[PDB]
Design a protein around this ligand. Structure first.
Ligand SMILES: *[C@@H]1O[C@H](CO)[C@@H](O[C@@H]2O[C@H](CO)[C@@H](O)[C@H](O)[C@H]2NC(C)=O)[C@H](O)[C@H]1NC(C)=O
Ligand SMILES: *[C@@H]1O[C@H](CO)[C@@H](O[C@@H]2O[C@H](CO)[C@@H](O)[C@H](O)[C@H]2NC(C)=O)[C@H](O)[C@H]1NC(C)=O
Ligand SMILES: *[C@@H]1O[C@H](CO)[C@@H](O[C@@H]2O[C@H](CO)[C@@H](O)[C@H](O)[C@H]2NC(C)=O)[C@H](O)[C@H]1NC(C)=O
Ligand SMILES: *[C@@H]1O[C@H](CO)[C@@H](O[C@@H]2O[C@H](CO)[C@@H](O)[C@H](O)[C@H]2NC(C)=O)[C@H](O)[C@H]1NC(C)=O
Ligand SMILES: *[C@@H]1O[C@H](CO)[C@@H](O)[C@H](O)[C@H]1NC(C)=O
Ligand SMILES: *[C@@H]1O[C@H](CO)[C@@H](O)[C@H](O)[C@H]1NC(C)=O
Lengths: 308, 312
């Protein structure tokens, strides 16, 4: 079922009733990967108690060497998900990665506050929830305040009910890459106002973005402040977009690589530390004023450079 | 009060043989170490000539030498007679030594040319820093007599002489990186005397940091005179001048990387290649962001650190 190959323990519970004892092998192992194989775990509701204070195990959990957890392909009910979260709370788990999960049913709000792994990194990819516009607000109810990196991919919904969303005090990186249906307007509905006081980096790769100015527009609407913005891998268009917009005053790094650009876009910030404009379709070398003052400029890959 | 000469780790064996003429015993401690450094404290090893037979076949140690885990060797601070240095080179030849670094040495006397050809370690890398030789312009030809044709990297720092007699110098079949950094007196004319015609067919990278260069075009000119071809040129840490230099010069056709960082440049110099993959112009003194034509077509441009960007 499981296997402690070096630091990893690819604990596999695809088969109906698994050999959980194996799990005790996935102990002392810093990296753990759980593959539910799409198997439903709604039968654990009748078997386990979510308010369980595993006396017998408390010390094990607190002594585990676990640091990076991945949980993929499984139809887990909300109750068991957060149950596990609460349990992990007393462990030293730093990074969590939920993937291809169908979290079902509603769970009651937790009693106390901040019950949860003191995570630095939380990654979600193709996770569906019982509710759909409040899943973020609810998951927050079990998260600690030190979260630094939040990655959300292929969400079925990001149009948050922002009044219920809370402040992410330490969140320095928000990665909404791979949400082809998000869009600039959709981006405004995701970046809840005043909820990312410390954001420094915002990644939006392959997220339906159309123009840098349009994105700047959304950033101003969201009253967001930040240092880096990655827009690589979007199909940016040759268009006016928003004719006027001030970029966040702290913006010093813009990525526009692999966005199929044919012209340098207008409305770029005036001064930048780095501007990655590589692997696009510029057929002419950028003119003087056409570009911002850049400390590090990349144009590698464009047609005008190839001399094949 | 028992510090043995060579202290071993698992890969790094460091030896100290500075004591007034003793303890050669340690060494067998190094056996099995990938890296080895031999410090001689500047002591003179000239006494080894009356004791060791430059030709003697180390039969008793031959296998040991053939079984050493030795890959990178550094030999520094010592006055070693030529005969001994090449004697050792010959010896290591049967070992799997890949990189050699000689530094702060005073190689003395002369040595007879080797009967055979290519009797030395099969090096990928050879480094010299502040090494002096008996002769002074033939030293490169002579050292060559003992080297294998597979050398990929030759680095020469603080040399007392780079004005080689090129007719004697032979081809470096595989040399791809030639590093002449730290030769402040070299200059652009002196560079021409170091780049022996046709001796570096496969050169790809030429590094010339802190080597008295003055203008990119003056360097280009030197390269043209040497009929040298290459892909990368590093001129960082030279005090490049605000001057015309050579008003006309075609760059080697394969050049795609020019480094002009930390050269105190105040203006974008003229005479740059038409197009480059990378142009590193950072940490200079540009007070104005470079104009259009002023720069070449560049894939990767760096201008970080210049004053025009500081907004302090
Ligand atoms: C996204 O995740 C969902 C999980 O809910 C995937 O769909 C499930 O896939 C498993 C197979 O592992 C099936 O047993 C479930 O019945 C599926 N449920 C649903 C929602 O239909 C879906 O395939 C994933 N998408 C991608 C691109 O991986
Ligand atoms: C700008 O965006 C590009 C494209 O996303 C970045 O290149 C990727 O970098 C990640 C990060 O390590 C790699 O995993 C990918 O393999 C890279 N993509 C490709 C196809 O090379 C690039 O690093 C960004 N540039 C800057 C200045 O950060
Ligand atoms: C360059 O290497 C030479 C060695 O050939 C150094 O000069 C010798 O230094 C030792 C000290 O360890 C003295 O005992 C010798 O008498 C010196 N010989 C000479 C040539 O006078 C010289 O110091 C080295 N330069 C640097 C910067 O280290
Ligand atoms: C251009 O040259 C500079 C300066 O020589 C390079 O920066 C140095 O790179 C070395 C070797 O990797 C580092 O160990 C030093 O710390 C760097 N020096 C300084 C002062 O920062 C730079 O990498 C070169 N540019 C390119 C494109 O390779
Ligand atoms: C976005 O959120 C608003 C506010 O709840 C809602 O009225 C609207 O239908 C949502 N639109 C989408 C695309 O989900
Ligand atoms: C190099 O050395 C030779 C012999 O000492 C000398 O005659 C010649 O002028 C030198 N060449 C240059 C260009 O310095």
């Amino acid at each position: 079922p499981c296997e402690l190959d070096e630091e990893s323990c690819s604990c596999n519970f695809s088969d109906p009733k698994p050999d959980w004892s194996s799990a005790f092998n996935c102990l002392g192992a810093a990296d753990v990967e759980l593959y539910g194989g799409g198997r439903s775990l709604e039968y654990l509701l009748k078997r386990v108690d979510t308010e369980a204070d595993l006396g017998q195990f408390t010390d094990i959990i607190k002594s585990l060497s676990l640091k990076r957890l991945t949980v993929r392909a499984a139809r887990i009910p909300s109750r068991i998900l957060f149950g596990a979260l609460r349990v992990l709370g007393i462990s030293g788990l730093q990074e969590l990665t939920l993937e291809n999960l169908e979290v079902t049913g509603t769970a009651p709000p937790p009693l106390l506050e901040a019950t949860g792994p003191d995570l630095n990194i939380l990654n979600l990819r193709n996770v569906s929830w019982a509710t759909r516009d409040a899943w973020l607000a609810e998951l927050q109810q079990w998260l600690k305040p030190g979260l630094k990196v939040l990655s959300i991919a292929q969400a079925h919904s990001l149009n948050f009910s922002c009044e219920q969303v809370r402040v992410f005090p330490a969140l320095s990186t928000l990665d909404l890459s791979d949400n082809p249906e998000l869009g600039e307007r959709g981006l405004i509905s995701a970046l809840c106002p005043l909820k990312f006081p410390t954001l420094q980096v915002l990644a939006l790769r392959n997220a339906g973005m159309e123009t840098p100015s349009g994105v700047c527009s959304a950033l101003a609407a969201a009253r967001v402040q930040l240092q880096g913005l990655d827009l690589s891998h979007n199909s940016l268009r040759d268009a006016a977009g928003a004719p006027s917009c001030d970029w966040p005053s702290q913006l010093n790094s813009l990525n526009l690589s692999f966005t199929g650009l044919k012209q340098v876009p207008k409305g770029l910030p005036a001064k930048l530390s780095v501007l990655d404009l590589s692997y696009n379709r510029l057929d002419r070398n950028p003119s003087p004023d056409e570009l911002p003052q850049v400390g590090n400029l990349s144009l590698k890959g464009n047609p005008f450079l190839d001399s094949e």
